[PDB]
Design an enzyme around this catalytic site. Structure first.
Site, PDB file in Angstrom:
ATOM      1  CG  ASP A  35      -1.812   1.186   1.294  1.00 11.92           C
ATOM      2  OD1 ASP A  35      -1.917   1.895   0.282  1.00 11.92           O
ATOM      3  OD2 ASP A  35      -2.427   1.403   2.361  1.00 11.92           O
ATOM      4  CB  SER A 199      -2.049  14.207 -13.518  1.00 13.88           C
ATOM      5  OG  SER A 199      -2.431  13.955 -14.854  1.00 13.88           O
TER       6      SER A 199
END
EC number: 3.4.23.22
Length: 330
Positions: A35, A199
């Site tokens: 994770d 992004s």
């Protein structure tokens, strides 16, 4: 040193991925959910409340000659999906894919919430976010990667998750045969303890690319792709009959649909998520309403590049002095 381990989807939907981890002496192999959105290595154990164990493999520290109770240490964690676990702490030897850390904090669960009990395939979590998020008290502990870093050939790990197929976590090296083209690296903020990056935009299907900054986290422990409501609406508007369902808890779409791809930007590079990766199947057995793999982050407070996005790429978690993320197509 290096390590290399195969990671395997837990079910036919890729709801999560499990990677075998050796703990203790002699080794006890548990299948952990790696994770990159959390920083605790915790396991089902001989200390876990018996009614909360249902098929998981347990760590038994009393059978490990290298286990040592970390005196006074406790841990307690709550995840974004509302699940939680807590317990006490041992140090022990932990190996992943041939890479060994001695003295790793292994957090032994005394209590786990129902969603962990109900998932017999996940024996615990191995956190790979920054150690500043580790929950051990009163002395915070380091992640497996943080402990291994100095010994690694290069201070990196890579995630290469498969679509409906096994993939690989590598530590200490970049497998140049595992991706196509080049790796585009992008800046990371560690201020929230995550692999947080920005992004450069998105496209839906064959549509034009929209240049827009989307701050979010690279999180292997989250199944889906969570993005701003505007972006998610633009995606699902291209699917006839798709709608956001308050009763189901997100966007659903007709199971008869063919889904468009979704592209996200990494600098000037582009990662394409095929439409099929966005199909999470019937909302309930036999239903013709299917659950979408791109969902709104509006109720979270952060955008999450979970498995839906990461499995479309070869992803480098660069733990150099100034961390960065790398993405390549594959």
């Amino acid at each position: 040193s290096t390590g290399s381990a195969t990671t395997t989807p837990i079910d036919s939907l890729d709801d999560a991925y499990i990677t075998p981890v050796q703990i203790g002496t002699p080794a006890q192999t548990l299948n952990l959910d790696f994770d990159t959105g959390s920083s605790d290595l915790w396991v089902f154990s001989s200390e876990t409340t018996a009614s909360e164990v249902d098929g998981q493999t347990i760590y038994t520290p009393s059978k490990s000659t290298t286990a040592k109770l970390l005196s006074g240490a406790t841990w307690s964690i709550s995840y974004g999906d509302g699940s939680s676990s807590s317990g006490d702490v041992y140090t022990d030897t932990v190996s992943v894919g041939g890479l060994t850390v001695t003295g790793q904090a292994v957090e032994s669960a005394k209590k786990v919430s129902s969603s962990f009990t109900e998932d017999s395939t996940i024996d615990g979590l191995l956190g790979l976010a920054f150690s500043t998020l580790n929950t051990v008290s009163p002395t915070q502990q380091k992640t497996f990667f943080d402990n291994a870093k100095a010994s690694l050939d290069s201070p990196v790990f890579t995630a290469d998750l498969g679509y409906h197929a096994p993939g690989t976590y590598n530590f200490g090296f970049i497998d140049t045969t595992a991706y196509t083209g080049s790796i585009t690296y992008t800046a990371v903020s560690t201020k929230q303890g995550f692999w947080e990056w920005t992004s450069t935009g998105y496209a839906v299907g064959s549509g034009t690319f929209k240049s827009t900054s989307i701050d979010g986290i690279a999180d292997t422990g989250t199944t889906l792709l969570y993005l701003p409501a505007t972006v998610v609406s633009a995606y699902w508007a291209q699917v006839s009959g798709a709608k956001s369902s308050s009763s189901v808890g997100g966007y659903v779409f007709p199971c008869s649909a063919t889904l468009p791809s979704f592209t996200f930007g990494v600098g000037s590079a582009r990662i394409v998520i095929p439409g099929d990766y966005i199909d999470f199947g019937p909302i309930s057995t036999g239903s013709s309403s299917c659950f979408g793999g791109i969902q709104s982050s509006a109720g979270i407070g952060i955008n999450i590049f979970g498995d839906v996005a990461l499995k479309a790429a070869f992803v480098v978690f660069n733990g150099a002095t100034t961390p960065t993320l790398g993405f390549a197509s594959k």
